[PDB]
Design a protein around this ligand. Structure first.
Ligand SMILES: *[B]([O])([O])C1=[C][C]=[C]C([N]C(=O)OC([C])([C])[C])=[C]1
Ligand SMILES: O=C[C@H](O)CO
Ligand SMILES: O=C[C@H](O)CO
Length: 245
């Protein structure tokens, strides 16, 4: 509309600056990528995917019959970092809670050889999973750029990934995080705990009421003390500033 690009860029930059971190949000409209934020050079830099990999882990596990969407993964009874992980849950529940143990079990079911084949087949990030099937998305060697993440989101949103349609639809159902006046936001957060500096992600898309899908990827540095919700807050403020929601 009437707001200048200068003003949108200043606003979105300010959301990162006010959080006292450095980051970017990339938005894709059709084929065009737009880069906003306070550290634009991050757009083509590699970071661990962290829990954003759960989207791909789920696609792989479902496609390869290593789980179903109704299967309840039982809690083993051992102490976890958060109480919400000390419970039985499905893949979709684990997606929302970013329950690493569930997705480590899924990864171990898939196994190293198949996992590597599938990550290569999808062309995800640097494509390298190394030798440890249960943490390769967390500590390396798998890495991905924000441009690659928004492009993955665009692929999933439009059922373009090399998986069955129904596999993609199943995973997409797991990713609904917010509804805002008629728009739906599908996304997965990431937080690279135990990498340094720590990366934060929120990668997904907006499905507008008219059916248009607008992929995005937020990437920032998570600082001591920071709440995970800052990823969501910056994302929503940016999308709102641009009129996408
Ligand atoms: B994900 O939301 O980025 C996520 C959830 C839980 C835990 C981790 N990372 C993690 O446990 O990393 C090690 C390095 C294994 C402590 C990430
Ligand atoms: O990393 C530190 C902050 O961006 C300072 O305002
Ligand atoms: O940039 C994105 C492509 O999707 C991966 O090489």
């Amino acid at each position: 509309m009437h707001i200048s690009s200068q003003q949108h860029e200043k606003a979105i930059k300010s959301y990162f600056d006010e959080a006292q971190t450095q980051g970017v949000i990339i938005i894709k409209e059709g084929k065009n990528l737009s880069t906003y934020g306070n550290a634009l050079a991050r757009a083509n830099k590699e970071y661990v995917p962290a829990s954003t990999f759960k989207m791909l882990n789920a696609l792989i596990g479902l496609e390869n019959h290593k789980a179903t969407t109704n299967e309840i993964f039982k809690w083993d009874g051992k102490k976890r970092t958060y109480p919400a992980w000390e419970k039985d849950m499905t893949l979709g529940e684990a997606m929302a809670l970013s329950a690493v143990p569930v997705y480590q079990e899924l990864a171990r079911r898939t196994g190293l050889e198949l996992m590597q084949k599938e990550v290569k087949r999808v062309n995800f990030g640097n494509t390298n999973i190394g030798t440890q099937v249960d943490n390769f998305w967390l500590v390396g060697p798998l890495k991905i750029t924000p441009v690659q993440e928004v492009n993955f989101a665009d692929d999933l949103a439009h059922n373009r990934l090399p998986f069955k349609l129904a596999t993609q639809e199943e995973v997409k159902k797991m990713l609904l995080i917010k509804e805002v006046n008629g728009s739906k936001i599908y996304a997965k957060s990431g937080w690279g705990m135990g990498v340094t500096p720590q990366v934060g992600w929120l990668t997904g898309w907006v499905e507008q009421a008219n059916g248009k899908k607008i992929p995005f990827s937020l990437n920032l540095e998570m600082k001591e003390g920071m709440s995970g919700s800052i990823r969501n807050e910056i994302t929503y403020k940016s999308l709102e500033n641009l009129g996408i929601i």
